[PDB]
A paper describes a structure:
Haemoglobin (Hb) is a tetrameric iron-containing protein that carries oxygen from the lungs to tissues and carbon dioxide from tissues back to the lungs. The haemoglobin molecule consists of four polypeptide chains, namely two α chains, each with 140 amino acids and two β chains each having 136 amino acids. Distinctly, the SMSs are warm-blooded animals with an advanced circulatory system which is capable of maintaining elevated muscle temperatures up to 33 K above the ambient water temperatures at a depth of 150–500 m with a diverged air-breathing mechanism compared with other vertebrates. The SMS haemoglobin (Hb) structure belongs to the family Lamnidae.
Numbering used by the authors:
A (entry chain A), B (entry chain C): 1 to 140
C (entry chain D): 1 to 42, 48 to 136
D (entry chain B): 1 to 44, 48 to 136
Amino acid sequence: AFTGVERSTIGAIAKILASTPEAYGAEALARLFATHPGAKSYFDYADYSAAGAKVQLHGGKVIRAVVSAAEHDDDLHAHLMVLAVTHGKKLLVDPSNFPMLSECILVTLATHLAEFSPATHCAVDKLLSAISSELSSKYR
Amino acid sequence: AFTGVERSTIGAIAKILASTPEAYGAEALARLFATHPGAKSYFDYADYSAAGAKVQLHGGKVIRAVVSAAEHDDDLHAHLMVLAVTHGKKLLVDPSNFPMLSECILVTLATHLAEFSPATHCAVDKLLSAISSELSSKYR
Amino acid sequence: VHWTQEERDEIVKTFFSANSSAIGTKALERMFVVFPWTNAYFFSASIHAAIVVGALQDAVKHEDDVKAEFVNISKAHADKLHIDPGSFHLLTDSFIVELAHLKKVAFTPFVFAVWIKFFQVVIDAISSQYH
Amino acid sequence: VHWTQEERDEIVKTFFSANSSAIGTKALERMFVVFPWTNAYFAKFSASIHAAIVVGALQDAVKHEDDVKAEFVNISKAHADKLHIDPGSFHLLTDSFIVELAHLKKVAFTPFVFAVWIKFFQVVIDAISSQYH
Ligand code: HEM
Ligand code: HEM
Ligand code: HEM
Ligand code: HEM
């Protein structure tokens, strides 16, 4: 599913995320909570904005993991199994939430990156879709 | 991830569906159109009920493909690739339609089958979700 | 939200004739199996089914005003119980499957679309106080 | 739908001064690359011309934030009854618009302002979906 041109583009995006995973993460989760408040139901937080300590914490973990998925483009099924088990069996997050978060990550990049062309967006969205798929795979 | 009990139940449901594919498929489609009329957009039909001749024809094709998928539980990616290309690149079906149809096939089974336990329903839904996933795999 | 008489009658007569408690108990057990993550929050299935079915009857009693009767139920789900609203339709879709089970050939695509519509109205009502 | 003044102002000021046709043109173009199956309706052509149509309708919703449903009757019938647009694909357009508003507004596109635009677009999606039967 990954063309040479997408692999390159994902690589470059991964490197920029890696520099500031908590900032990117906290913002994407703040978007989630604002545009889909049902997602707040999983989190016992006082502050659901990007300012929130616990939002920052989860946000970095999200983005660090996306970065790693990016460094695992041809292995994603095996690479993501640990996380699929935690989300799917321990935390029991309803799988409908993964593609909401994906779109919130994409919107965050659009507000930040000098360049977010339709080709680049397509590339990242493909990475996020594969991530959502794996994270949704160990529920039942 | 099909347990032997799931494999066996799926096998059982597949033989049932195999006996009357047009019956089952035309009903599942009339359900799709009735519950999600946005789905009619793809079909230049005059009759969208299970009595429609073109409903019956697509219906049979759908159900036979499910039956045949039920024989490929271990290699659905390879198996459903042509159908994924056909739906994704030629027919250009918005993938959100696939789970709507799946649920409509589940309801159809529930109105007809001599036994539709939560265990059996789960086995089938997992198959259908696997199918939806493949058919959504070759858009981009 | 505008209802046809056929829709009002199908929903009202079913509630007045079928054992919707029994339907609920089975729909809860179904949702737990098909959608295991929904068991997180939960106990007796039949006693909880009574309370759920109470709320639905409340909705049926007031088909034009479901939201306004659902305020407090909605707040409880969002603020105290912290139920993911994205999971509401997994219960209501299980109800439809148990309705299919009961009604068999009478569960026509038309009648099926009636229940779908009723449940969507329910979902919107119980989702309304998530902020 | 009830609206705060910040919601009205955020939408209204944006349509007043932003180059909304250029936004629409890029959003449409984006939606084609990100969601290719959506180009199926346009085989049957300038993205820019089409954006001008959409943007006029958005402006119509803007001018009437409290009665959008009522202004979209004929628009919606056309999409359901003549053009055969899958209504499940409407948000692919509006989500691309949101991506284009993010690109214009940068850090001003806060999660909060983001949610104003999502609310706006869902009212629009509901309005243009209302005549699918
Ligand atoms: C790309 C998607 C996501 C990734 C990569 C991700 C990653 C992670 C990681 C690495 C952890 C710590 C897990 C551990 O300690 O083993 C975690 C915790 C957690 N995740 Fe996610 N997550 C994602 C999406 C979501 C979504 C969409 C939700 C619900 C809407 C969610 C809910 C949670 C919760 C509740 C915790 C526990 C900590 C807390 O309450 O803040 N996750 N996640
Ligand atoms: C389980 C899922 C489905 C299966 C297995 C399936 C299978 C098939 C098959 C075998 C054909 C014959 C086309 C060919 O290969 O020559 C076909 C045609 C077609 N399908 Fe599907 N389909 C499914 C779901 C859907 C959905 C949800 C839609 C749209 C809502 C859809 C839209 C179409 C259209 C527009 C055609 C051809 C037009 C025509 O038949 O006249 N399919 N399908
Ligand atoms: C959409 C249809 C639903 C209706 C009509 C409904 C209705 C209710 C009502 C009326 C109550 C009691 C409120 C009170 O305590 O005053 C309740 C409690 C509860 N609900 Fe729901 N609910 C629905 C969906 C759900 C779903 C999908 C879940 C979980 C996935 C859920 C989880 C719970 C839990 C954990 C309780 C507390 C039960 C106890 O402590 O015994 N509900 N529900
Ligand atoms: C949801 C936001 C949308 C708005 C506000 C909107 C608005 C409009 C309007 C006002 C028209 C002109 C109808 C007329 O008076 O003849 C139109 C036409 C059209 N729309 Fe949409 N539309 C939207 C979404 C979509 C989407 C998602 C598609 C498909 C991807 C689509 C496909 C078309 C086509 C093919 C035409 C006719 C163009 C022509 O042949 O002249 N529209 N739209």
